[PDB]
Amino acid sequence: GPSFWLGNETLKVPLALFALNRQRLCERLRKNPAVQAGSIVVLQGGEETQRYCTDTGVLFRQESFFHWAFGVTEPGCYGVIDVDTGKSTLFVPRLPASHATWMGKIHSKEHFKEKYAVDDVQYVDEIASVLTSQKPSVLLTLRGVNTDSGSVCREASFDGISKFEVNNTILHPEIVECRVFKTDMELEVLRYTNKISSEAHREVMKAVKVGMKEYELESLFEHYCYSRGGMRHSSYTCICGSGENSAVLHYGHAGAPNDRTIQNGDMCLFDMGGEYYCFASDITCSFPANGKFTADQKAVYEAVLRSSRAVMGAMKPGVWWPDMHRLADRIHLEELAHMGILSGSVDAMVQAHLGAVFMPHGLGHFLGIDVHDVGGYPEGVERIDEPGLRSLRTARHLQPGMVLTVEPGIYFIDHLLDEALADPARASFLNREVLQRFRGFGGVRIEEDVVVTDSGIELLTCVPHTVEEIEACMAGCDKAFTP
Amino acid sequence: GPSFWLGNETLKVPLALFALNRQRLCERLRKNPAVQAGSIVVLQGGEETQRYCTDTGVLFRQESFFHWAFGVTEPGCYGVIDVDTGKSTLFVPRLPASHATWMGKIHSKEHFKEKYAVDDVQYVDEIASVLTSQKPSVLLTLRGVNTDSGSVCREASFDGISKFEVNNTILHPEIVECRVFKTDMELEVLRYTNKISSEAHREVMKAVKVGMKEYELESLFEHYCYSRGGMRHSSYTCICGSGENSAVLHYGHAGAPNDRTIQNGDMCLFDMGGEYYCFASDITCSFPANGKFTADQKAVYEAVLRSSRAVMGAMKPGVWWPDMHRLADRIHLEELAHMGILSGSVDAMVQAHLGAVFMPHGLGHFLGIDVHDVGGYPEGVERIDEPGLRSLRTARHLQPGMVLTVEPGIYFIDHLLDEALADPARASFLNREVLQRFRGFGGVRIEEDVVVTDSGIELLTCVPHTVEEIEACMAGC
Ligand code: PRO
Ligand code: PRO
Ligand code: MH2
Ligand code: MH2
Ligand SMILES: [Mn+2]
Ligand SMILES: [Mn+2]
């Protein structure tokens, strides 16, 4: 069957991937005792947008649930799936004749049927008549809360939908659960997004020079991903933090726009990931700007490497993800004590939540069509109300097919360090005579993407993440070179 | 005073630029007989957005009117201007402590006052209290219709605004008219955006090879503009049309996403422009993929070059922009007739609107903060209901300080050609036996950005646009 492909060395993605997702969704809904016979899933695709009131078009990127079910890149579509039969119908806009002058060929409905391997294609303005003819019992629309944004997924609507019975509660938890477990075809795409992003990270590490602006490397990363990977989008705005900016977890946004000059002795923390056909990647490489770790930089880096490796070695089905976060905390505290930054009982440090001073974010998150992917907190899975752990994007137990980031880090964040020094329950663990030397260090994060298997994990990422590999990469060594 | 700068060789833009815009706006409002003493202009900045219901942040780009007035890059702000005194007050978000962990330094109000050279800075949550203290007669908010999108500019709102008298009709035409006329400081930025975009077009022309995907050149263009020019955004989605796609005027969007392989013998039409600090550029280069014009490609190309140069040379204050569009039409028809595609009286072809078959779009448009900049059709300026001219984005007469694109083109668009061939009033002019050789040609567009001066124009763009220049650039010369 047909495939999405951007030529050259880019990945061919079979449209069968989306047919399987639809099949899996129907199979799950058929098992759901509350789903009525004759139900139809109704999804509304994204629409094209402009900047504010101007006619400046914004490049259209499909809504993620609609993409997951259909793989459709055109704006203005709807899509329906008959639960009982699995039959799929794509609704496409009826375009004006002038479209052929300004925007491109006005493809036939049959063109879209063959392109997307759906069972039927109709025009959007006929949706009410088409659905009436199918005599559905209930329309299942999409409404629910994203647990990272807090936003409500807005459900499909069309003129005449009020004449149908509409249920907007069943579908969201079910399609979310389908998205949590990646198919073999989806894993091929996530292997590819990690491959290209890993290559781009290596090119960035080879290119960094003292005196460059952070955004020069953002630009290079995105250029590699697009020109060599066909990744028109990134999965999120590139985080290119040098020096003290490496302690700012989502640095690089419009208010702090990757505009610092890289200086000798700085650590760089580059958290970047290209997106291919709406599939994410998320990789973080930390490294010295000048290509040579100092003793202090090596020690911090090695501490995060130890926690990364311990978590990856422990991950398997049945493991509770908060336990991995606590494991990383304990290891960071142990290693910071071995460095002389902390002293005393690590057991007592953990009770005082001292780990969250150095790692205020979650250990890692589901990844998929969204970089912070859906399904981390389904009903009954509670957020843990403690420093650090409350920022975890899931508190689930690991199961085969989940895709997670593993991204421990250690940072030197002045307001968190000063809070600890003002708190009698935490202050005594800090050795200011050594800590002072790490003020303004920034931080280190080591992030890889992994798949939970039947017995452990598969590593998707291939970047230089040991001290020796990093120094070798920055010295221009071939990838195949093993220091 | 302070300047916006992204380091390296990027342009330092003085924040005085925006102070001058605020002063010019107040000067216009003070002359408006409907404006009451004690009025305050209230603008609302753009807010950060995410992809649909996800937490995936969209890179924030400021709303154009707010940028024009204040130059502010942070989301979530408001800005007000006392009309009588010109005093400016910026309102910034009061950020939570966690901002320092996740997003960066929590700058003080004094930092923002120094950065933006405004008279006062307050927190957004104080806007109602601050404005109440000033006892305004009326708040002037922004509402009006963009004549390219048809969308309504949404006016500022804040908690408590219902307690004030609000006027939402006066401001839009006045701030639009100020944007139409670029200051010398604005022109310096548009010279720079054209400089970097021109350099990037040259790099793209040198890099094009048969067998590449169109999007490889989109990527290179944007990489040059960002890494070398500090242009994090483009002014619009890059149009990288090869072969038949060069006849698709806004090719490159998500439904036709620059995904064709460039083939030997194809024409390329690359319409791309980087954006620096929310100032646009818009440049188009057309050229043969293999670096050598065929006779047919050269003839089409030189026809568009002729109209490009004729229009630029005729532009001066007082010229009616529709006349320039018709001038390009007439030249195209003359040249297509010389090539044997057309036959008969060019005067009669013009009366039949045949030029619009080959150039269905407007000759060019205002350019500024937005690539299709505001103010093309103020009240009293009417759109001309004829093929081609109806797509003109302004029907104004030219005046000094206006910034225009000049972008004639000739395209071979099947449905327009076929409609003309069905019409006995136009079919006689077309020679099917010659036209058939140009079916699937695509098209040629040549675009320059210019400023109207007291005596003529100043050309901002510097790209290879003669056949000799193009072939030399592409041969690695
Ligand atoms: O948002 C998160 O969960 C991770 C933490 C570091 C940056 N991204
Ligand atoms: O939209 C416009 O007015 C011009 C015509 C060709 C592409 N841009
Ligand atoms: O977390 Mn990247
Ligand atoms: O027209 Mn660009
Ligand atoms: Mn991540
Ligand atoms: Mn233009």
Author numbering:
A (entry chain B): 6 to 488
B (entry chain A): 6 to 482
From the manuscript:
Prolidase Deficiency (PD) is an autosomal recessive rare disorder caused by loss or reduction of prolidase enzymatic activity due to variants in the PEPD gene. The PEPD gene encodes the enzyme peptidase D (EC 3.4.13.9), also known as prolidase, which is the only enzyme in humans capable of hydrolysis of dipeptides containing proline (Pro) or hydroxyproline (Hyp) on their C-terminus. Prolidase is particularly important in the degradation of collagens, a family of proteins where proline and hydroxyproline account for up to 22% of the amino acid content. We presented here two high-resolution crystal structures for the p.(Arg470His) variant of human prolidase.
